[PDB]
Amino acid sequence: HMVPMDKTLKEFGADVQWDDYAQLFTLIKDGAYVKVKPGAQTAIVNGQPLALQVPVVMKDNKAWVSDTFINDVFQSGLDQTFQVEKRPHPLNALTADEIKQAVEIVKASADFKPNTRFTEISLLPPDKEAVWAFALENKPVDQPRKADVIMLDGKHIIEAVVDLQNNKLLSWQPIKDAHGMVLLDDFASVQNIINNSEEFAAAVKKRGITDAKKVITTPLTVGYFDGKDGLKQDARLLKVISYLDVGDGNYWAHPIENLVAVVDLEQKKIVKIEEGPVVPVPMTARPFDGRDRVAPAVKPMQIIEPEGKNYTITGDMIHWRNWDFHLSMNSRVGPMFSTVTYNDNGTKRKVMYEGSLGGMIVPYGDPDIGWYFKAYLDSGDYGMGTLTSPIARGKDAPSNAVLLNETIADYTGVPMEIPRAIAVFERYAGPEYKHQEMGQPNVSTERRELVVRWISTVGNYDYIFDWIFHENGTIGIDAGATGIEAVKGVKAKTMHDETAKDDTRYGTLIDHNIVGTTHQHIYNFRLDLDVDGENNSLVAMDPVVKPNTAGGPRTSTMQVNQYNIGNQQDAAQKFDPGTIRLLSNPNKENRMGNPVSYQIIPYAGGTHPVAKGAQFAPDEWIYHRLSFMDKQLWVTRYHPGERFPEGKYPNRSTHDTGLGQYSKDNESLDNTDAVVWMTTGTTHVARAEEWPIMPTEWVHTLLKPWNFFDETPTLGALKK
Amino acid sequence: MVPMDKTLKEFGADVQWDDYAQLFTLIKDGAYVKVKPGAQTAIVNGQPLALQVPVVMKDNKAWVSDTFINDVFQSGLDQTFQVEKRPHPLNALTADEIKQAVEIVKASADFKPNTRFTEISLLPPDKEAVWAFALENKPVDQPRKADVIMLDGKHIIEAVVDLQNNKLLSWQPIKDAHGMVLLDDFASVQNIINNSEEFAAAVKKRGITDAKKVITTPLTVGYFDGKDGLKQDARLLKVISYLDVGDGNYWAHPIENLVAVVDLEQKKIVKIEEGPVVPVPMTARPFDGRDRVAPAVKPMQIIEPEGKNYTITGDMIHWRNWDFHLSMNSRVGPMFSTVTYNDNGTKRKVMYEGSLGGMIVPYGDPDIGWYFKAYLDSGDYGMGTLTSPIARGKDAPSNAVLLNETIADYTGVPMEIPRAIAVFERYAGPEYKHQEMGQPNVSTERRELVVRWISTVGNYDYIFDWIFHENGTIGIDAGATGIEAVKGVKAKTMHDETAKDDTRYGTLIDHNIVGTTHQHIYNFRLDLDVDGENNSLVAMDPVVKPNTAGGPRTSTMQVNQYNIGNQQDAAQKFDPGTIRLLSNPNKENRMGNPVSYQIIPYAGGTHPVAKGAQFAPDEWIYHRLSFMDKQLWVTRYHPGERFPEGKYPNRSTHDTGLGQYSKDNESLDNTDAVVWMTTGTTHVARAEEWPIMPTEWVHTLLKPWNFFDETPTLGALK
Ligand SMILES: [Ca+2]
Ligand SMILES: [Ca+2]
């Protein structure tokens, strides 16, 4: 039995290239680079020969292979990229079996109800000291594997802990006043509830819509306004904004402006319809998928690694040059980078215990009925890991990437495998260093970066996160944004129309009858750096101009004001990118007697205007609830339950339970276990170039070794 | 027949042999060639080629016809380079034109023996005529002319020559101008130091046994209103010295607190300054890998097997919607001219001319070896002349095309710089994406076209990337690598007695070595013509305002928009939370918004950012170089206003650059504007940067702002 080679390999996700001159197929998938000629009894996999019992057969310009070919070639072992993990790492995410087991254990209590959903099922953080001992000494972790199981019982949150080793429930705790995040079934519920509302269909008819079945809803959290929004605090509510489906694939381009429904998800009813002035729906077709466009003629470009990759993935442990780290997936915040070490001439040095997205927010600037409450807490309120967008091979990541699948629990407690959840790729990044001494031979070396990329889409916007490991010890974290603008329907077609000035008070006119409402994108990263050890201090170095007291012609000099920042409140600060902020180990020095440090750069640039803080007056509730928005650098003491800058349960939160809380108490940051949080944000004023789809815009952050090493780290191995 | 591997390697092509496929793959610049031994045909950029003589194998080595390279690589099947039948009027002087210009000035009775040439460059035709050539194919009516700037000993003279008519048009001595540093000045300084008995005696006192191991570096002396003791009419350089210990890295062995002042016309040392004795740091610190073994790395190639998406016609680059002209200047390096974006068939002006304006690397230490130290790399040393040829595959990616460029050397002889500029397309993530829940994904790849140039001035190496985005954005990024300028000190570690004093002005980065704090400050001159000549500068400041519309919000996000109508206000600090546009008030997009580009002088960087000059405002460097202290400048177009530091900045007594250009109250309203962007870093050193500094980058951007009507990369409508 034999299958058509081209079709089968494409199903499988391999790139298939035929060279008619060479009579050669080149097949590429992840770490496998394969060469095979029709009729040959050997193929080449990553430069190594593989015997084929059944050769590729060409017949009438059509290739056929055996139905074992794909497994024989790609799973041969000659692709060495993935290796089997001997002893499981204690930070490995919950397996499918462990998820199913946790869901069985909670279902075995009399309190479980059939409408109960799971907001999160995740590994309970094992003891940090023990985890580091596993990574650095191979000391086994004695404590049992546990899962945190967070349930939504109607509107009530319950935190359960289950012991997986012993198969028992350890705790079951109602969380008073907490609201749950938005779950996947809420999207369908809102759409269904609107479809069944007589009142809503009438409201929609008054605004020009002839067919109410073409209305697309989007669910938004309502925030908190101490009753000014007229919404009861104990109820599970969402607000609902609507758009008209005109068959262009882009309902986002057809807002039904000034109509908001408030839905109670327990009652499954619209409890309030807020109605403002009638604005005709913008109707013009604005597809972004290319259906109305000519396909580009473009010459091929491929990035190829024909002998395989320089990294090895052993279970979830990535090894690459001097770097080693563990990579896992969480349903709320996505990728987590753990037990990150740098091998310094045989000694693995601690750099970071755990790093991940902390949380993010996209808050809007328009006071109108459809907008005033609008703020996407993308990870906290919607679950960015859950909403991971599978990588489009060769487009969302380069042609030389390896794409990883990742497993999490869905909202019913069923395992869910996300295909192509994370891309890993090595890239050329210019010269690592160069010196061309006049009249001498050149010295140049190439820079290589290892990128780990993850994309999550929450409604209209798509977010890309790159964690960039530099060979020289630097770590970059870049955040990209693309997708479809949230737009306001307006009466102005151009800036010459009567309502244009009022229509554009809170955003730019980017199409006829369409305003891209101004807003911010604010990302926060939680980085538990352990700079060559647990015990670290925050050090400021401010470059300053001081009078010259040394004689000679100069009136001034360049000096530095250096000081320790010993308490948390002072550590919560604006970042001046002309200053230096270090996390230093006061117990370990480099060869020159300088404390081994990492320089923390929360703002290393971006392509949109930068946010210096929150674009909200300080008496706004969103400002009060989310302190993380207004400072770029925070340092707190390590605590395994302080993970989210917005707080654990931010939906309708009445006060700051995140970084505002964590940094509040005057506890010492001197020579202790510190956690760094970086906030970086943009202020997005729209332009027509961003409509109907926004070209990817980026912000950059950096962590740089600062006297962590003794010399240029990439010089190579010493031959003496 | 000739041997294939030897012949192709001499041609500069990469040769790969695949034993499984019995296939050679040959790569050079835009040519991607496949050829089987014995085959009667080959493939060049995906197209078949008949061979006169098959590749033959003898003793497992390939042999080819002695015409193989011509037949295959110059077949015409590589379409990367095309013939230029009508030369663009901004084409740089050719080798023949350089020689002719030199003969014209040498024929004058005023030409003095031993005269040198600081600059020989095209005197460009008028801007209107050049645009009309680029946009309408209109011949420029004028003869080729050259500016010829001569140094007669220490005296500067500007001449103009008409190359068509082979005559001298003008000859003008420039009163009080000092010339830039020329190549022979480096050797003169070393020789003058080698023949000084006083200097050898001074060196002996600092513990140097062999004075012929002393390596000099020439530095310009600046201007201090006589406080440095230096006569203003003399051609002077200061000389800082290092010890050669045979590690290839003299920079690592400073002879601290010894400065010689050399008069180049007298050819002697006119002053020796001697400060405290600090033993020379002696430990070998090679950077060239002589003491190192690199880890093995698996190969990575970036391949374009059907050739490139860009075409190079003479000096005119065409790529996707972009067209521009690329030429080389001896002072500032690459110049990007007549830059247009092809919007659905109509070429629209974006930039008449853009280039490096100038740069400065000024130090922060008041001591005798340092107080005057400020490298004006382009103005004082000539960065074009000092271009560093691209190391193929390392300094630029394996899919680059490397261009040669020709300029005049200081004696007036044409000089061809091999691999002077790299051009390459690169993958740059998704151009855009939207994964609508439950629907098919939409993603497209981003491609960027990078034009990269590297120049090395003494110890530091600078990389400039001009990045053309398919979507209309232009990035300009500046990278710095090379060897830090270091101070010799007594402290071995921060525990030693002198450590605190030793590190007052820089970090201790090695035993006895301090990386003195300084800035790197770059300025780009960008004659943007935003869809036309006549433009205005517009500020948009995002602000929080009280809510007056009702409902629960206390505040809103709005913008304060206002025009900036005069030059003095246009010279400003850049707040990256604001928006600054160059707008065309005469042309609007489909929504009635003025077509504009957004100017972003600070889009990030990897070293700390300079908020301005790290100098008190009574410092002479501060007074002379105003461009250092503001990030955005906008001036009225003038073909003679090119350099932010001024035309003759060596020992300048006042600002003849941007301080002068932006001084007067003339209107920027609806007129031909030139944008200048200053971006800089404050470099505080660390051990990770010694003995060689990993490349650090700064980023700037020019973004279309309602220049288009929609996403520019969606494609043409069916
Ligand atoms: Ca820590
Ligand atoms: Ca202009």
Ligand SMILES: [Cu+2]
């Ligand atoms: Cu946005």
Ligand SMILES: [Cu+2]
């Ligand atoms: Cu520097």
